[PDB]
């Protein structure tokens, strides 16, 4: 736990780098997660659900 | 205590335009600052007026400028005033920068006003370039085409950036509308930076033509400089009047009174006169990317004057060799201007390269050498 | 580096008396004719070389270049133009 | 640049017989053409003073020398704004152009440069 | 008996010396990474960034290879 | 090369430690006790300091007056102080007056009367001392600094104790305190100067033989402190000079980082505008402060206790509009112990300390204080050769490591006294404990 | 009420484990989460907002 602090937080350069890398990962995964959720709550409604008829 | 000093708001005006302590010996070259303020005001007044009559749609832009010329009361005046004052803005800005280089205004303790100034100069170039596009005549279009295709030389992303700025695959309506919005905005940004460079300068105060301290002998900005500034205002307005009323198209290019035609390319794409030196620098480098870097470096290299001037003495009033070198530098900058409007033909190709080398070597070689030697001559020569 | 009135940052001054007269008591244009002629001549003579040398040089350069360019695009200059390209 | 640099380089030149033979006459001409003497300045009055080092050297001037300097700057400023030159006793004669400030600024700088050197010392 | 203190002046420039700067070299590394991550993050949306950088990353790279079915694409 | 410090024990477990110097004519004998204010609870806080007053108020044999005369006839003087962890009672005398002085000290420690009449008399004297320390600003600042840093803990109590306790201290509780604490196994009889060790040991066998031994004899310098980042402001706009202390939790005597912390302290160093040489000192903070007239003085300190410490700086300044700059620059200099220190600063500070730790010992009192302090904190005297080796082992890498664990981005205890309007709130001071650029 | 060395009662607010790395790390996890969402939010904002400047759907046709 001291180790975690020393590596990622103690130097601000490291902390800002950690925050931006986390932001990148969050951004990508959150996009994917919302996409799937939105598709489930709006099931059979969206174009992707009816497109197969055509 | 007097109201002008007591009240916080009044005190700020007071500190800049009334009680501001100035050197008592500023000569007429210190008046370009206020002329540039006058140009900036005329451009805002005429500019906002034209915006009330101009339509930014590409199907209507050129026609809206004709409407201004032909139908709007005094529209001809507002249009020509705006177009010509853009030329006078650059005459005054080159003069003001020339004054600053000759009198060493860029030296400590005034590096910050100088460096902000270099940014004001870039914003003025961008502002004037975008304004030129708004007419949507042939020079407007062919200007935007060629200048925004320089960005294509940025490696990897260059093409993508160009299409993003144009808002399409060519210069067209999207480009015109966005340049209108930006051309309206940029002069306000330019005004803010103008005000920042003055606030920065307030810590040291104005330099003076002798390059000595003026702390020994100060004059209030008003009335002395107020009334001195009127002389150059009236001199400026006389020159303004001769262009605007008697020869309104002397400084311009007829090609911009032909509506933009993406098919027909004009005889000669030459920029407005005040951009011509940078254009010549760009042509000198054969490489596309090289050329663009050189052109930008020709402006940003002004930022290193504070380093490369090694003199112990501020300014050129007392330095005969520096004065000669500066004379050659200024004339070379005008020759570059002239070479920007000749055709890319012998013998101007080689000549343009030599003038470009001379331009850069002033900052990189000659000024550091000459200023070092003059230091030694002052010391030995006065023993 | 610069102060304000009262603490401008001058080294202490002492022993200088300054005198001047009112603008209403002066002739503002006293000796203007003499200055416009003799003083302007003096000041211009002293600075003439610093303008004449660079201007004359760059004008000569331009003149030579523009005349060569003109000559290269004549019939007479066909061959020299062919070599230059 | 530093005044120290100017002074050291000048001393190298004045040492070399060859160099001095060609440079000292040039420098004398240069100073005649420079024309600061025609405004009643001494060379040292022209050195840039808006630097912490130079401000300190000016504070170390003897009061007399300091008062005289203030007068020369005010006098020159008045000639500047009038576009007149000094006449008669106001013109600085070559014998009056003494380096009154160089000793003081060389001491200020000596200390400042020693301070920089010593900030970088490494015990062995 | 010691006659004189024993020291050297290390080369310096603008108040920096090599011992000091060497301590900061790692930090410029991390800031450079932070700037790299940050820059790349900002242009993640640019199609060229995906085509040329992001889709080439092993395993993860398929996240950025996405085709609109030609039936659903007006252009 | 210093003479060897001889050490003997008695049967009860009293340590006798001596460093003879046949060049001097005076001697300092005294008793260093590994006991102080910290040994009190909250009800008997101030007892240790109270006892110091009563120790000189007469014994079972000699009355107060007889005591005074006996010391006057010796020729030298007696002195005592109580700190948080240490109590000292010593006697500076002539060479051959040592048997008298040991006899007097043994008497005042074992056989003090502590008569109700004298307790009652001192109870006013000590009450008046509560309102006159107020003047000793450095001490005020340090007392508040401990109070806040070790809030509601034994180290955080003052030495004087609260007014309430001073009124309720009885001879019974005084007797109980010195019976529990001033035990043979916690005491060192120290002789420095013109003393023979074997003579001193015989005098200890004669006078300190019937000292109580503690039930559980732990080794000397054996001790739970939980530092609280916190601030006390004692603003007083009527004072001309601001006094400010900033400290972080430091190192104990027996820390592996003890010398590393001292080197770090020396890198910041001390400064005093009244001393001629101070404007030329190498310390970066010294240069900033002197060039900018930010302070009258600063003094870096590294106070150790058995199980914790405080490491910090004490600043004084009349520049009340630039206190922010003074604190700003100070804390940025500490940041550089974490980010920037190299062989340059570390080797310079080691050189200054290799001398400094030996220079301090320049009279018999200082030598005795050194033997006493070290024996009661480490259980042995550390020879100059060992001290020189421990300092040599301190590398730049060690200092950076230590600072990054102890100073960088850590909570501070902060005390300001005087015209400290310009000292920003806790957050802004604590924000300077790190650098965003690093 | 009189002695200034008797620090007021702060026991309602003092954390027992205050000088542990665990303790500091937690608060920086909150600050860093906030910085992370702000960075992700700023990227989203900038990318979406500036995309207005890319060719619009009529142009792309
Ligand atoms: C365009 C916009 C319209 C607004 C008008 C603003 C222009 C005013 C200005 O700044 O220049 C006037 C300015 C007069 O200003 P001043 O305050 O009397 O003196 C400024 C000089 O530093 C003082 O210079 P000096 O005292 O050494 O006088 C030099 C000057 C003589 O100055 C005279 O005016 C005569 O003559 C020359 O240098 C001419 C060179 C030889 C030509 C053959 O004209 C010049 O001196 C031009 C010299 C440039 C080369
Ligand atoms: C055309 C070339 C001009 C070279 C000038 C040389 C100096 C000179 O004689 O000028 C007269 C005067 C001489 O003034 P001065 O202040 O040196 O001397 C006054 C008189 N004494 C010596 C007694 C103090 O110089 C100026 O006022 C020069 C201002 C420069 C403005 C240049 C604008 C050019 C734009 C290019 C931008 C990039
Ligand atoms: C608007 C866009 C904001 C994006 C923020 C980008 C990431 C920076 C960040 O979170 O700041 C944390 C950092 C650090 O917060 P901090 O300053 O509390 O942390 C310093 C102490 N250490 C290094 C031990 C953690 O803040 C900054 O560096 C300021 C930049 C923010 C603007
Ligand atoms: C543009 C149009 C200019 C026209 C305005 C000029 C003023 C008209 C005459 C009035 C006048 O001379 O009286 C003074 C008013 O001037 C003033 O108070 C102003 C003095 C000069 C006018 C403007 C100052 C210009 C300085 C900077 C130019 C900026 C251009 C940028 C837009 C007061 O006389 P007094 O106050 O000396 O005392 C005298 C005792 N009361
Ligand atoms: C809108 C454009 C600008 C305006 C309105 C402006 C206005 C002014 C004014 C009013 C002053 C003080 C009066 C004077 O000395 O003339 C001044 C000083 C100065 N300006 Fe500008 N300026 C502009 C552009 C620039 C540029 C482009 C530069 C530099 C590249 C610059 C650099 C300076 C410097 C260095 C000074 C201090 C000079 C001195 O007094 O010695 N300015 N400017
Ligand atoms: C530094 C300030 C400015 C400069 C240097 C500048 C420069 C220019 C230039 C060079 C043109 C091309 C002129 C032509 O040949 O017709 C132009 C056009 C235009 N400018 Fe500006 N401008 C400035 C400020 C403004 C401002 C503040 C507005 C406010 C909207 C504005 C509105 C326009 C409009 C509407 C046009 C197109 C109509 C026309 O060409 O006359 N300008 N500007
Ligand atoms: C994404 C945001 C980017 C922020 C980048 C910040 C980089 C700042 C690094 C820095 O301050 O280096 C200091 C170091 C010299 O140390 P000193 O003189 O400060 O002790 O300087 C040198 O080593 C040179
Ligand atoms: C009304 C108070 C608000 C403060 C800002 C307004 C303007 C202001 O300060 O005016 C002054 C009159 C100023 N002249 C000088 O410094 C000056 C100083 C010394 C000598 C001379 N000339 C010699 O004989 C001068 O000409 C000037 O023209 O600068 C403008 C640019 C300022 O505009 C702004 O920055 C705001 C915006 C419109 C750009
Ligand atoms: C200094 C900052 C750096 C430069 C800033 C870059 C500016 C613009 C870059 C990306 C803009 C276009 O980039 C594009 O962004 C849009 C939305 O924003 C994304 O579009 C995606 O999300 C949107 C909604 O969020 C949907 O309508 C779309 O169907 C989907 O594909 C694309 O997947 C991406 O390729």
Q: How far is CA C68 from the centre of its chain?
A: 31
Radius of gyration of chain B (CA): 23
CATH number for the domain harbouring residue F122:
3.30.830.10
CA gap B357, B352 in Å, rounded: 9
> Quick one: which atom of ligand 7 is closest to the CA of E25?
23
Distance from CA of C60 to the nearest CA of D (A): 27
Annotated catalytic, F52? yes
Residue B288 designated active-site: no
Give distance in angstroms: CA of C80 to centre of ligand 7: 59
CB F243 within 8 A of CB F141: yes
The SS3 of residue G40 is: helix
The torsion angles phi and psi of F33, rounded to 5 degrees, stand at: -115, 130
Nearest CA to ligand 2 atom 21: B317
Q: Are F191 and F368 in contact (CB under 8 A)?
A: yes
Residues in chain G with CB shorter than 8 Å from the CB of A18 are 32
Residue of E nearest to A28 (CA): E63
Of residues B272, B293, B93, the one with CA closest to residue B193 = B93
- Residues B378, E60: Cα–Cα separation, whole Å: 68
**CB-based contacts of B245, cutoff 8 Å, min separation 6:** none
**Of ligand 1's atoms, which has the minimum distance to the CA of residue B27?**
17
DSSP string, G8-32: PP-TTT--SS-SSHHHHHHHHHHHH
Are A11 and F409 inside 8 Å of each other by CB? Answer: no
Give the whole-angstrom CA distance, residue B258 versus residue B268: 13
With contact defined as beta carbons under 8 Å apart, do F74 and F101 qualify? yes
User: B222 an active-site residue?
Assistant: no
B272 included as an active-site residue: yes
Q: At what angle do helices D17-34 and B367-382 cross, to 10 degrees?
A: 90
* Displacement of CA E11 from its chain's centroid (Å): 29
Find the farthest-apart pair of alpha carbons in chain C and give their distance in angstroms, rounded: 79
Query: Which range marks the domain in which residue D89 is found?
Result: 1-124
Give the number of the ligand closest to the Cα of residue C54.
2
Q: Which residues contact F171 (CB under 8 A, 6 or more apart)?
A: F114, F115, F116, F119
Spell out the residues 6+ positions from residue E56 whose beta carbon is closer than 8 angstroms to its own.
none
Contact B95, B32 (CB under 8 A): yes
Please name every residue paired with F82 in a beta bridge, in sequence order, or none if there are none. F87
G40 lines ligand 3 (CB under 6 A): no
Residue B96 annotated as part of some ligand binding site: yes
Query: Could you tell me which chain C residue has the CA closest to the CA of B109?
Result: C1
* B188 burial type by CB count under 10 A (0-12 exposed, 13-18 middle, 19+ buried): exposed
The single-letter DSSP state of residue C38 is I
C-alpha G8/C-alpha F304 separation (Å) is 26
Q: Is the peptide bond before B347 cis (omega within 30 degrees of 0)?
A: yes
Q: Are F236 and F38 in contact (CB under 8 A)?
A: no
**Is the CB of B232 within 6 Å of ligand 4?**
no
Residue B249 among the catalytic residues? no
CA B206 to chain centre: 20
Phi, psi of B163 (to 5 degrees): -65, -30
What does each C-alpha distance from D97 to B377, D4, D101, G59 come to in angstroms? Answer: 14, 19, 11, 75
* A30, A53, E72, F361, G54 from A43: Cα distances, Å: 20, 16, 18, 87, 32
Domain boundaries, chain C: 1-85
Q: Give the closest residue to C8 by CA, choosing from D105, B13, B204.
A: B204
Question: Which has the closest alpha carbon to F39: F25, F49, F29?
Answer: F49
Site to substitute for ligand 1 among B24, B25, B28, most atoms within 8 A of C-beta: B28
Q: Are F83 and F37 within 8 A, CB to CB? A: yes
Judged by DSSP in three states, F340 sits in coil
Cβ atoms of D124 and D69 closer than 8 Å: no
Asked if G43 and E42 come within 8 Å (Cβ–Cβ), the reply is yes
Q: Which of E11, E15, E17, E20 to mutate to test the pocket of ligand 7 (most atoms within 8 A of CB)?
A: E20
**Alpha helices per DSSP H over chain D:** 3-15, 17-34, 52-59, 63-82, 102-118
Resolution expressed in Å: 3.0
Q: Which of B272, B309, B371, B374 is catalytic?
A: B272
Residue B69 host element (H or E): helix B61-70
- Find the length of chain F: 438
Size of chain E in residues: 75
Q: Do F151 and G3 touch (CB under 8 A)?
A: no
Q: Quick check: G22 contacting A, CB < 8 Å? A: yes
Chains E and A touch (3+ CB pairs under 8 A): yes
Q: Which of G32, G42, G47 to mutate to test the interface with E (most CBs of E within 10 A)?
A: G47
């Amino acid at each position: 736990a001291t180790t975690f602090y020393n590596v990622f937080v103690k130097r601000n350069s490291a902390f800002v780098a950690t925050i931006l890398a986390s932001a990148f990962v969050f951004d990508m995964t959150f996009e994917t997660a919302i996409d799937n959720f939105w598709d489930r709550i709006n099931a059979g409604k969206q174009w992707k659900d009816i497109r197969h008829k055509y | 205590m007097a109201l002008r000093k007591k009240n916080s708001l009044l005190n700020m005006a007071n500190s800049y335009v009334l009680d501001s302590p100035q050197p008592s010996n500023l000569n007429y070259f210190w008046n370009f600052g206020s002329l540039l303020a006058l140009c900036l005001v005329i451009q805002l007044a005429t500019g906002i007026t034209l915006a009330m009559h101009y339509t930014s749609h590409a199907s209507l832009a050129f026609d809206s400028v004709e409407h201004i010329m032909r139908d709007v009361n005094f529209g001809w005046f507002i249009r020509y005033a705006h177009a010509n004052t853009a030329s006078f803005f650059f005459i005054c800005i080159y003069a003001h920068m020339g004054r600053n280089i000759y009198y060493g205004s860029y030296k400590t303790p005034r590096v910050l006003p100088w460096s902000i100034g270099v940014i004001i100069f870039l914003l003025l170039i961008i502002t004037a370039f975008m304004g030129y596009v708004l007419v949507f005549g042939q020079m407007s279009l062919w200007g935007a085409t060629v200048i925004c295709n320089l960005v294509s030389a940025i490696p990897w992303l260059g093409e993508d950036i160009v299409h993003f700025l144009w808002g399409g695959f060519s210069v067209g309506n999207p480009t015109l509308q966005r340049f209108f919005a930006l051309h309206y905005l940029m002069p306000f940004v330019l005004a803010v930076f103008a005000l920042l460079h003055l606030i920065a300068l307030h810590t040291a105060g104005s330099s003076n033509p002798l390059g000595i301290t003026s702390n020994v002998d100060k004059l209030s900005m008003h009335p002395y400089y107020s009334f001195k500034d009127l002389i150059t205002v009236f001199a400026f307005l006389l020159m303004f009047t001769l262009f605007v009323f008697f020869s309104p198209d002397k400084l311009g290019h007829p090609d911009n009174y032909i509506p933009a035609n993406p098919m027909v390319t004009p005889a000669s794409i030459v920029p407005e006169w005040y951009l011509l030196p940078f254009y010549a620098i760009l042509r000198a480098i054969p490489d596309k990317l090289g050329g663009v870097i050189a052109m930008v470096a020709a402006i940003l290299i002004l930022l290193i004057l504070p380093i490369v001037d090694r003199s112990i003495i501020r300014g050129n009033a007392f330095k005969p060799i520096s004065k000669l070198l500066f004379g050659f530098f200024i004339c070379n900058f005008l020759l570059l201007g002239v070479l920007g409007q000749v055709h890319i033909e012998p013998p101007f190709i080689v000549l343009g390269q030599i003038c470009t080398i001379f331009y850069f070597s002033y900052f990189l070689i000659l000024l550091p050498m000459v200023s070092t030697i003059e230091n030694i001559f002052f010391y030995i020569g006065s023993l | 580096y610069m102060g304000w009135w009262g603490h401008m940052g001058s080294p202490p001054q002492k022993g200088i008396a300054g005198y001047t007269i009112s603008p209403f008591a002066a002739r503002p244009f006293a000796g203007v004719v003499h200055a416009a002629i003799f003083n302007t001549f003096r000041r211009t003579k002293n600075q003439a070389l610093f303008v004449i040398l660079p201007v004359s040089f760059f004008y000569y350069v331009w003149t030579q270049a523009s005349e060569k360019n003109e000559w290269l695009y004549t019939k007479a200059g066909r061959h020299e133009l062919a070599k230059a390209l | 640049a530093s005044i120290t640099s100017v002074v050291k380089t000048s001393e190298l030149i004045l040492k070399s017989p060859l160099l001095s033979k060609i440079v000292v006459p040039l420098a004398k001409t240069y100073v005649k053409f420079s024309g600061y003497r025609q405004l009643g300045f001494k060379m040292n009055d022209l050195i840039i003073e808006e630097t912490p080092n130079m401000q300190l050297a000016l504070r170390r001037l003897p009061p007399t020398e300091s008062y005289d300097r203030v007068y020369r700057l005010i006098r020159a400023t008045q000639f500047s704004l009038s576009h007149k030159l000094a006449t008669g006793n106001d013109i600085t004669k070559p014998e009056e152009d003494d380096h009154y400030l160089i000793p003081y600024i060389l001491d200020v700088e000596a200390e400042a440069f020693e301070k920089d050197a010593l900030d970088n010392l490494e015990v062995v | 008996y010691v006659k004189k203190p024993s020291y050297k002046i290390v080369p310096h420039f603008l108040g920096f010396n090599i011992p000091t700067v060497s301590k900061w070299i790692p930090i410029f590394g991390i800031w450079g990474a932070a700037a790299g991550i940050g820059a790349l993050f900002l242009i993640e949306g640019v199609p060229r960034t995906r085509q040329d950088i992001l889709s080439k990353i092993p395993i993860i790279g398929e996240h950025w290879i996405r085709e609109i079915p030609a039936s659903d694409n007006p252009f | 090369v210093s003479p060897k410090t001889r050490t003997s024990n008695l049967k009860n477990g009293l340590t006798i430690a001596s460093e003879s110097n046949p060049l001097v004519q005076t001697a300092t004998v005294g008793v260093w006790i590994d006991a102080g204010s910290r040994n009190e609870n909250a009800y008997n806080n101030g007892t240790a300091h109270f006892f110091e007053h009563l120790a000189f108020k007469g014994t079972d044999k000699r009355s107060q007056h007889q005591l005074e005369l006996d010391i006057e006839n010796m020729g030298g003087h007696l002195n005592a102080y109580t700190s948080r962890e240490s109590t000292v009672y010593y006697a500076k005398s002539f060479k051959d007056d040592v048997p008298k002085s040991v006899e007097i000290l043994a008497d005042i420690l074992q056989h003090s009367k502590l008569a109700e009449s004298a307790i009652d008399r001192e109870r006013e004297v000590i009450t008046r001392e509560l309102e006159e320390v107020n003047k000793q600003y450095e001490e005020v600042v340090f007392d508040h600094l401990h109070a806040t840093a070790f809030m509601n803990q034994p180290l955080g109590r003052t030495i004087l104790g609260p007014r309430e306790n001073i009124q309720t201290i009885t001879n019974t509780e005084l007797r109980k305190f010195i019976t529990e604490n001033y035990t043979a196994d916690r005491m060192v009889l120290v002789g420095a100067g013109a003393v023979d060790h074997d003579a001193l040991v015989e005098l200890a066998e004669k006078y300190f033989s019937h000292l109580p031994s503690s039930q559980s004899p732990v080794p000397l310098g054996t001790p739970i402190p939980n530092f609280v980042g916190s601030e006390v402001r004692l603003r007083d706009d009527t004072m001309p000079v601001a006094h400010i202390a900033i400290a972080v939790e430091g190192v104990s005597w027996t820390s592996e980082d003890y010398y590393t912390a001292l080197v770090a302290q020396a890198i910041i160093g001390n400064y005093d505008r009244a001393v001629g040489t101070s404007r030329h000192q190498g310390s970066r903070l010294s240069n900033i402060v002197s060039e900018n007239n930010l302070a009258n003085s600063f003094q870096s300190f590294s106070t150790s206790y058995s199980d914790t410490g405080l490491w910090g700086i004490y600043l004084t300044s009349e520049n009340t509009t630039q206190i922010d700059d003074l604190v700003h620059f100070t804390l940025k200099e500490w940041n550089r112990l974490s980010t920037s220190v190299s062989n340059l600063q570390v080797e310079r500070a080691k050189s200054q300390l290799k001398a400094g730790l030996l220079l301090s010992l320049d009279g018999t009192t200082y030598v005795a204080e050194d033997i006493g302090r070290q024996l009661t904190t480490l259980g042995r005297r550390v020879t100059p050769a060992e001290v020189e080796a421990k300092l040599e082992a301190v590398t730049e890498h060690d200092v950076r490591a230590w600072a990054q664990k102890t100073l960088y981005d850590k909570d501070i205890a902060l005390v300001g006294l005087g015209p400290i309007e310009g000292l920003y709130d806790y957050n802004r001071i604590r924000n300077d404990m790190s650098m965003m650029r690093w | 009420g009189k002695s200034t060395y008797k620090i007021p009662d702060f026991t309602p607010y003092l954390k027992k484990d205050r000088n542990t790395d665990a303790n500091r790390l937690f608060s920086y996890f909150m600050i860093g989460s906030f910085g992370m969402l702000s960075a992700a939010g700023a990227k989203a904002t900038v990318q979406d907002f500036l995309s207005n400047m890319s060719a619009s759907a009529d142009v792309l046709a």
